[PDB]
Nucleic acid binder design. Structure first.
Lengths: 313, 320, 320, 317
DNA sequence: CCGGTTATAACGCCCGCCTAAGGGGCTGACA
DNA sequence: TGACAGTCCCTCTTGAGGCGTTTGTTATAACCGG
DNA sequence: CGGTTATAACGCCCGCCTAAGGGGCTGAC
DNA sequence: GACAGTCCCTCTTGAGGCGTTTGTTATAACCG
């Protein structure tokens, strides 16, 4: 029943799996049992699995990566939940759709992209390229996260609960300060509200620093024009800018300039890494800016002039 | 006003000489554990109940993986030591808790600005946090004997085994230090004779090493409390160092009045000590030595904002 | 003559397209395994016998942990694939076979001195080992199509999946290369018509990708053998590259006559390529690219003798 | 057959490729453990009998804390790897008291004077122990091809724990080295023409892979002995390398024939190498690499008054 | 044109198998 | 008569080395009824 | 003095404690 | 009424270390 899926969700939350990971796994576990007439996975195994996966490939045109997530979700279910791991030989129809090469803009392309973009989104997207931030990393920024004493930005808890310090483009200082000032206004106004629970804080932080939620420094850098009503603990707070809006903002502006390469937020991040490299920065330097734990990962972001030693003999 | 059980645990621990902060910590998760199962006795519960509690903290409780981990540390003790019936849970952890906070340092100006507001008799220990990078409790647990005027340094004793470290000491603080060692003897003299006074607190290994040590000024705290207190692990009166919470509150409000916008705590002063030493050209191994880092990687974090920021990596946006 | 069993295994493998050197290797440890149990059938033996053999190698046999490990790799195959009855041994290893050899490079003078003695028709491939740092078999398996005169480089295809790498090419070798591609077509023409010739060997994935490829000069080896040979995985005649053992013997004796005292092998030439690039100031990531290293740590070994030796670390004896 | 059980333990370990010295160490403690009790089988024993032997080592044994530790591990090995029945982690026993004396470290002038009253017969070897921080056996096992004159360096093959490394060399020794090599060349040229000369000894099964290697000069030891030996395995004679023990006392005597009241031995020359490099400003990781430590944290235990010279940041405010 | 479930891309970094070497010899048909 | 090449051989090693990755976790990009 | 013991030294992840940073109450001056 | 407090807490950790006789592998020190 729907009580088994809830127990799986609880298991994962205790083991502190990422939220997105839980949704991903659940979704594939869900439409797995859904595939079969909702028959309990405990009464199934390798056989039923190597069918769902093949069902995803064929008559599903699922992407090779998509199939992979599913494979892992299922494997998780059978190893961690029902302590009875699948076999490593499960043969199934592997997808065919080959992932298109990572799109990477060019100086002038980006230069023109940052043009036809309304000021309402100029700063955010400039941070995505100027400091190679991820979409949500940029959207979750907080006033205290911007360091003017050193040209840098503190990215707290990025993908996989890792903190990092990234570079900032000095030229944005005036823009940033203005943006902060803009956020200060909403703060000064929202402070005097019948039901303002201040800014949302990471896991049980409001309990440790009950005052933090009402301190400006903890407030989002890019807040929304209105206010929201937080379901948990019926209170209102000023949530941050909408991701989706920024996502299409960059998509449209990308069209309103030419560039027929299908450019999105993460492609601006790729450009950041690519451009730093083309200027001579060291790979490990780029690695640290992106937050990769190992250079070998960054090397998959680098896809002559050497005179043969024989010639110097 | 608390349960007879909690009181028995607190005493069990005080006998094994567990740290004060450990007792407070473990107890807190134990009572929270108990009051979650409606005062049911913990000896009647086991893994099942512990996991239900941990899950509780994790999901609606929204606690952090590390705090849930401490909770499990408490309950594990409660069952391994007290109640000789160890747990058998599987810490199928996921997220790694080696991830330190991103240091936030104050500009030399913000520090000057801070010290201007920190009222007297509060700034000697505060100037030591920044001047010697001491950690809050290393400062509070300093002993007269620890200040070295000959070589201008302070000796910090961390952990047992006689492990120590010698940090730098600002000489423009000697007269202030002398006034303190004096104020210290001013209490030591009026206390040496009270037949309550059991002498200054001292680590078991030391107290037995130099049985007379607890009564010699040399071993007395540099920043003594305004009054005598009762040592919970021996039930005798002795003079404890000033309450650390005092400085924590002090620093926080002083910065608030000083008009500093970024959060300022004792740690902050220590971070600033490290960063400023680096900015002047000190070698990381040196700064590593000054702090107590046994691994340079730890010390290296203070390096990032420097050469991992604008001054070290030029933003691609700064070009085209 | 050898056993009918060994012959069956050799064929089992040749069908799964296992590498030639793999077959020779696995077979060698299998026959040695068999002849150790007095030629008893391996299907009648199991873990017990395998472990007794491994122990034999280890102990009086005095073999190296890695070679004993390959032996276990062979037997594991012999039981997992052929004889569907997998082993169940515990590789309770102990040495850590990640420990690469300490590279030994030749001075630019010793290399000049070497090339002087290496007779003609032997030095084009040898000059490629040093001139482009190629690995012996990457050199022997080069194809006409792989030499790029426009950009002065060579394309090396390692592993399947279409994985490759582009190395530098000494331009003072163009005319020599042209003579070779010619000599290659001189064989390609006289062979294209023999109704034996099945074309040049080609990776399964490729051969099926471009079914005509085996017959176009483009895909033919740059250093063809003096005569046609029979492909064991398809039983057809084709022209293979020159036998690598030829160069191995060549280099070895040429250095001997050249009066070079240190051991010289093909690897040696590759090591020298790397070191010399570094000495001239090339960046390790670059040299890493030139070789096929996926991890700089590998490339870094060539750095040690440089800045980890006298020129980088001054011996304390050199002072007092 | 008790001596057979010990032989099976030795075989177990050799297959799992434990170091030779490790096998001897473990065996020796396993041996005098069962020896402790009337030679009774360890399979019929456990925590109880163990926490007695160890206590027996401490008390009425005055065994060094480290010595006790090795024993504890040897025993634990026996009960975990051999008789798959691991001891408990609570085994309480009398811990030793003898505190290891601080690592002795000479000084520039001390070493300077030490290298003086040493006969030329041992001047080069000991100079390598300090000049390149080599370990005793590392220096004694050197081979002609191991010295790199093109770059000031020495290739130390398979040092402690099967690890290879490249260490620095003192250029000034080039002439001495070449002379020493020339000296070894003479013995080689003479020994080559011998009725039963199996050439130089090679590492594990190397002579089978390179049957000619044993007769190549480059593979011959740098510091050979004046005579020849008769290798038990494969009845043949070869020129083994200089005697360790002789060098060990050589450095001990010369240490006395100077002054130096600190009890100086070979590894103390190595400590000096690390210490001196550090005192000159070399980076710790640099020293780490020269010694062969896999982690700096180990080398940091080689960096233990004066003036820190660190001006307090408060003073610069 | 929009929010919400999807679908995919991206980060994650060890080691189990397989594949290169380096040697000494050994046959042939060949200048 | 010999130096050389062999899809050579070998019951010869590995002081030999490297490719490969859809059984892991966690983001952003994209699809598609009101 | 050499064959045996004794014992330095390399090894380097993470379990279990301990230290913080915060509001707030309160009892001796 | 400020204010320090072996304060209090059924606060938490955007918190951080110490510690290390239950591993291996060398060299140094014993004694007949």
């Amino acid at each position: 029943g729907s009580q088994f899926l809830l127990s799986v969700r609880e298991f994962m939350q205790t083991r502190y799996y990422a939220k997105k990971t839980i949704e991903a796994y659940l979704h594939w576990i869900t439409r797995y049992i859904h595939f079969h007439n909702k028959k309990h996975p405990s009464l199934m195994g390798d056989k039923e699995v190597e069918e769902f996966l093949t069902y995803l490939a064929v008559q599903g045109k699922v992407a090779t990566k998509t199939q992979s997530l599913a494979l892992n979700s299922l494997s998780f279910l059978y190893k961690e939940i029902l302590k009875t791991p699948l076999s490593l030989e499960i043969r199934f129809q592997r997808s065919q759709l080959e992932r298109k090469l990572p799109v990477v803009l060019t100086r002038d392309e980006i230069r023109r992209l940052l043009e036809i973009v309304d000021p309402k989104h100029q700063l955010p997207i400039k941070l995505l390229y100027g400091s190679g931030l991820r979409l949500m990393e940029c959207m979750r920024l907080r006033v205290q996260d911007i360091d003017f004493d050193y040209g840098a930005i503190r990215i707290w808890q990025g993908k996989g609960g890792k903190n990092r310090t990234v570079t900032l483009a000095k030229e944005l200082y005036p823009h940033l300060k203005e943006q902060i000032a803009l956020a200060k206004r909403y703060y000064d106004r929202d402070l005097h509200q019948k039901n303002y629970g201040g800014v949302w804080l990471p896991t049980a932080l409001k309990e440790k620093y009950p005052n933090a939620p009402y301190e400006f420094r903890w407030h989002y850098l890019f807040p929304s024009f209105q206010l929201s009503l937080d379901p948990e603990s019926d209170v209102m707070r000023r949530h941050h800018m909408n991701e989706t809006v920024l996502q299409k903002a960059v998509r449209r502006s990308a069209q309103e300039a030419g560039i027929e390469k299908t450019v999105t937020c993460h492609t601006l991040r790729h450009s950041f890494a690519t451009h730093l490299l083309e200027v001579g920065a060291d790979i490990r330097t780029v690695q640290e800016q992106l937050g990769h734990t190992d250079v070998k990962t960054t090397q998959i972001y680098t896809h002559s002039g050497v005179l043969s030693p024989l010639s110097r003999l």
